[PDB]
Write an enzyme that holds these catalytic residues in place. Sequence first.
Site, PDB file in Angstrom:
ATOM      1  N   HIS A 123      45.694  48.670  40.133  1.00 46.23           N
ATOM      2  CA  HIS A 123      46.826  48.665  41.047  1.00 46.23           C
ATOM      3  C   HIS A 123      47.992  49.523  40.593  1.00 46.23           C
ATOM      4  O   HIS A 123      48.800  49.958  41.413  1.00 46.23           O
ATOM      5  CB  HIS A 123      47.324  47.243  41.263  1.00 46.23           C
ATOM      6  CG  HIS A 123      46.342  46.361  41.959  1.00 46.23           C
ATOM      7  ND1 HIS A 123      45.737  46.712  43.148  1.00 46.23           N
ATOM      8  CD2 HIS A 123      45.868  45.134  41.641  1.00 46.23           C
ATOM      9  CE1 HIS A 123      44.931  45.740  43.531  1.00 46.23           C
ATOM     10  NE2 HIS A 123      44.994  44.770  42.634  1.00 46.23           N
ATOM     11  N   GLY A 131      50.381  44.195  40.552  1.00 43.57           N
ATOM     12  CA  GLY A 131      49.231  43.319  40.490  1.00 43.57           C
ATOM     13  C   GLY A 131      48.737  43.102  39.078  1.00 43.57           C
ATOM     14  O   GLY A 131      47.533  43.142  38.815  1.00 43.57           O
ATOM     15  N   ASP A 158      36.009  45.528  43.254  1.00 41.82           N
ATOM     16  CA  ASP A 158      36.833  44.383  42.924  1.00 41.82           C
ATOM     17  C   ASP A 158      37.195  43.716  44.248  1.00 41.82           C
ATOM     18  O   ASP A 158      37.098  44.331  45.291  1.00 41.82           O
ATOM     19  CB  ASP A 158      38.069  44.895  42.190  1.00 41.82           C
ATOM     20  CG  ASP A 158      39.019  43.802  41.815  1.00 41.82           C
ATOM     21  OD1 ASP A 158      38.852  43.217  40.739  1.00 41.82           O
ATOM     22  OD2 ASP A 158      39.936  43.533  42.609  1.00 41.82           O
ATOM     23  N   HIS A 160      40.028  43.082  45.406  1.00 42.96           N
ATOM     24  CA  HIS A 160      41.203  43.722  45.981  1.00 42.96           C
ATOM     25  C   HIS A 160      41.037  45.222  46.182  1.00 42.96           C
ATOM     26  O   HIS A 160      40.197  45.857  45.559  1.00 42.96           O
ATOM     27  CB  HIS A 160      42.434  43.453  45.100  1.00 42.96           C
ATOM     28  CG  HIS A 160      42.675  41.999  44.828  1.00 42.96           C
ATOM     29  ND1 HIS A 160      42.078  41.333  43.783  1.00 42.96           N
ATOM     30  CD2 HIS A 160      43.400  41.072  45.504  1.00 42.96           C
ATOM     31  CE1 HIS A 160      42.421  40.057  43.824  1.00 42.96           C
ATOM     32  NE2 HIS A 160      43.224  39.873  44.859  1.00 42.96           N
ATOM     33  N   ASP A 247      35.982  39.070  40.801  1.00 39.76           N
ATOM     34  CA  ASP A 247      36.726  38.055  41.534  1.00 39.76           C
ATOM     35  C   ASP A 247      36.293  38.057  42.988  1.00 39.76           C
ATOM     36  O   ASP A 247      37.100  37.928  43.914  1.00 39.76           O
ATOM     37  CB  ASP A 247      38.230  38.280  41.410  1.00 39.76           C
ATOM     38  CG  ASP A 247      38.657  39.689  41.800  1.00 39.76           C
ATOM     39  OD1 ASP A 247      37.815  40.611  41.789  1.00 39.76           O
ATOM     40  OD2 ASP A 247      39.853  39.872  42.095  1.00 39.76           O
ATOM     41  N   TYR A 286      38.691  35.442  37.492  1.00 42.66           N
ATOM     42  CA  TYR A 286      39.561  34.379  37.002  1.00 42.66           C
ATOM     43  C   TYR A 286      38.829  33.043  36.957  1.00 42.66           C
ATOM     44  O   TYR A 286      39.447  31.981  37.045  1.00 42.66           O
ATOM     45  CB  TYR A 286      40.812  34.265  37.875  1.00 42.66           C
ATOM     46  CG  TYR A 286      41.454  35.594  38.202  1.00 42.66           C
ATOM     47  CD1 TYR A 286      41.126  36.279  39.365  1.00 42.66           C
ATOM     48  CD2 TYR A 286      42.389  36.164  37.348  1.00 42.66           C
ATOM     49  CE1 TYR A 286      41.712  37.494  39.667  1.00 42.66           C
ATOM     50  CE2 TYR A 286      42.979  37.378  37.643  1.00 42.66           C
ATOM     51  CZ  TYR A 286      42.636  38.039  38.803  1.00 42.66           C
ATOM     52  OH  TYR A 286      43.221  39.249  39.101  1.00 42.66           O
TER      53      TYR A 286
END
Length: 357
Positions: A123, A131, A158, A160, A247, A286
């Site tokens: 990011h 981020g 990812d 995101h 994630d 996470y």
Amino acid sequence: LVPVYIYSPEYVSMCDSLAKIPKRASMVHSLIEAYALHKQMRIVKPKVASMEEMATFHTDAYLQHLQKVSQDSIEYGLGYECPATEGIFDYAAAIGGATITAAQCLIDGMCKVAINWSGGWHHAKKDEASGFCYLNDAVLGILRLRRKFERILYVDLDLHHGDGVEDAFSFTSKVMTVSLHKFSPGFFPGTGDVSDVGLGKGRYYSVNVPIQDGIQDEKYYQICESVLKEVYQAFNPKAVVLQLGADTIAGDPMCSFNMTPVGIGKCLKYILQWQLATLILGGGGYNLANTARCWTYLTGVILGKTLSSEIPDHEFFTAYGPDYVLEITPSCRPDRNEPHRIQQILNYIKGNLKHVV
Ligand SMILES: CN(C)c1ccc(C(=O)NCCCCCCC(=O)NO)cc1
Ligand SMILES: [K+]
Ligand SMILES: [K+]
Ligand SMILES: [Zn+2]
């Protein structure tokens, strides 16, 4: 001819130091080591990044303020989602140098694949953290691959949108960013719609696949294998930098997608077949155990081996309860992707690559 594993005990603890994901680096490595996979890889030691290397992307003004805070913060995206506390500069230069050290091995033919799971800090802006990214190793890595390869392909898987790395190259046709990320109003980072394709001579050299919650392996793979297909045609890459934020795996606290390492693995496989120099980076992730599971399994498909379903005993064995296996089960919840919308997209993209010379 054999995979490079960027690692050094001094580096892994450096990583675990980040509050956002405590001890994740150990768990990932440890689990891979317990599977005795480091015995099939050229364990290269990471080299810290020098100011003139981090400067090849980040403005000196940012790298200074970052060096100081590590010693008005809101200036350079520092504060909340970017803890302007202890010595992060060091931490950042380590990961950056880790990805550059990886990039290097790729050019010196030292390998065909280089891995640095502690990377994928996508990011980050040239002069602004974001981020939880204070430095952009992915970019610093692509810029290094640019020394040889005239055309790099960046694939961000990812959860995101890899906005950071895309903006960095959103104006060139020398590098191509391809991000498959959940996209919906009010979900970080907000950008990344399919209409997003780049600017100037970089127009059409940026690919974005907006996806929705609950998507699962088969559906996901078919969308990826598809897009990568058209892309391999149109762009014809010289090298490849792959971001694998885990994630997206079932069980992430993020609770958005519903992938399992197998689904990601097939995407990975497809890319490894182009037999190009490939730089492997981690990302989000996470649910520490699950992430370690994902990436260990993925290290396995990179080495061609098939790992034992049972989770070997190691320092973190206790975190793999209640089942203690390597497989991850999808969650019993709806896949909010309508087949028609997926196509409108695959099309729009299929027809946008049409413009790549
Ligand atoms: C205490 N708690 C449960 C939370 C605290 C902060 C955030 C957040 O800033 N979210 C927005 C930015 C998310 C960045 C994720 C980084 C990533 O995976 N990028 O790919 C979320 C949850
Ligand atoms: K681009
Ligand atoms: K992505
Ligand atoms: Zn993410």
